[PDB]
Design a protein around this ligand. Sequence first.
Ligand SMILES: N[C@@H](CC(=O)NO)C(=O)O
Lengths: 293, 271
Amino acid sequence: NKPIVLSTWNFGLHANVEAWKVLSKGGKALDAVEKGVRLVEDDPTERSVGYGGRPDRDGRVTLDACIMDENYNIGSVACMEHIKNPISVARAVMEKTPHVMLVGDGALEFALSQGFKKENLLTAESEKEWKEWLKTSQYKPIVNIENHDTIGMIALDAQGNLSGACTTSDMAYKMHGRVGDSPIIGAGLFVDNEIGAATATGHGEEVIRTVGTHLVVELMNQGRTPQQACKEAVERIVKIVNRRGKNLKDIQVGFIALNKKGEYGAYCIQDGFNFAVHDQKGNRLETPGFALK
Amino acid sequence: TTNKPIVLSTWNFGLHANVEAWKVLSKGGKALDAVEKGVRLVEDRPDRDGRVTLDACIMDENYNIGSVACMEHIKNPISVARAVMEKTPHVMLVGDGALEFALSQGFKKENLLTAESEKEWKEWLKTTIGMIALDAQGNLSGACTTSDMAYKMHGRVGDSPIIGAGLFVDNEIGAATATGHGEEVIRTVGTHLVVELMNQGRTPQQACKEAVERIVKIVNRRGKNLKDIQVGFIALNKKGEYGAYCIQDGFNFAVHDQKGNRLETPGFALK
Ligand SMILES: N[C@@H](CC(=O)NO)C(=O)O
């Protein structure tokens, strides 16, 4: 039932508190996801443990984010530098332009024109670690409990409307200009008010290649419970990884989903993914099942 | 009875791209080379700041994908997209980083703004192809490419470089490529939708039409007038059956199999 908000990782547990304040007050799902994410972007303690702080291999912090409302309105930004609140900029792309995605310079120029301010997002430690990783430049992207940077959040409000948001600076030491799943509708996020929503975390390339969240939602449309849909999407990714001659231990993909009745579910390739669910009973960290036994 | 090889592409000028793909396919070549060469032909207006930025993506028979968006100074984006897929651990590069990669792979940096495109942009200030193929081995691939920024905001990205929007290929199901307003293809994840419908037992024709019909319903729920929204798809399955459908009339597509290259007009929803 409802309202209910679900989100990826510890960062999501934190974002959930603000999201829930909006939701419990009868607020719009879209404000609640924007407001929950902004709570973590703006929390200096979260930033200080690395939130939104990963640099690409050129030492540049570049952010991917998108947001989706209950009526297929979307906004997204990819490879955006110097702006701390990318979800809000994505919301502006949605609301203030006839486009759905800006990237690079253009996404920053647009942010600046909407009143957002340039700041340095690169902490000294991250800079230091970057300088150190550059000695060998061995790109080994990892996504787990100790290494992640995503808030994917999906919520059903009091009116029975869905919305969602996804955002990251991951992956650290990506090639400059690299875009993950986080800003791509149907990869890192998809919301259809008639069926359900889903968001994701893990190796973005794999999410993008399988159009993961769209698949999850289409599986809810085809009769699956949210959990079953996440499981089947993950099982699709597992087959594809194998057909590709790759080793599944190198790949983490986690999905969470919400249907229109507020039922929820979650599944992942590997153990080492958790999500946060806040309904009327409170805010909980749950760990779903996984395919790689 | 499989119909292979077969290539389809969007719009009238698909006829010509099809002839380049067919040179590859008629010799038993890979779908992947066929679509690449095909949309290269199309490659051989700027954004509102006078900058020519290009988008492309490519998808082969085994879920390999590559994509470039808002990339400047490189004529043949589809081939950089192919380099992304094959030579990087990533699937999409944009902006300056896509260019820096292109240059490291030996692509030539060039000026893309023609004499007359420049003067038409200054003027305005004062006032695209998808291709899918099935090769002789029975494998699919797809490519699309776009170079018209239509004076949009610097950094705007349409559907051409987004997997599941402008292009999707599943070798155990089929392939689709999209036409029409990028923002609407993106929002509806159009080509992934088409292919999952083929996976739900629709023929390519039925999947294109039902995709479009779901999207008409979405446009309705958004309070927009269908006349302002153009979306369409062409699709191919593993048996070489194909189809095509759109919201509105006036889009054609080109199809080449052993019966030859030809232009066809699909059905449309807006009557
Ligand atoms: N999906 C992100 C990585 C991630 O989930 N990080 O927690 C990416 O590919 O950029």
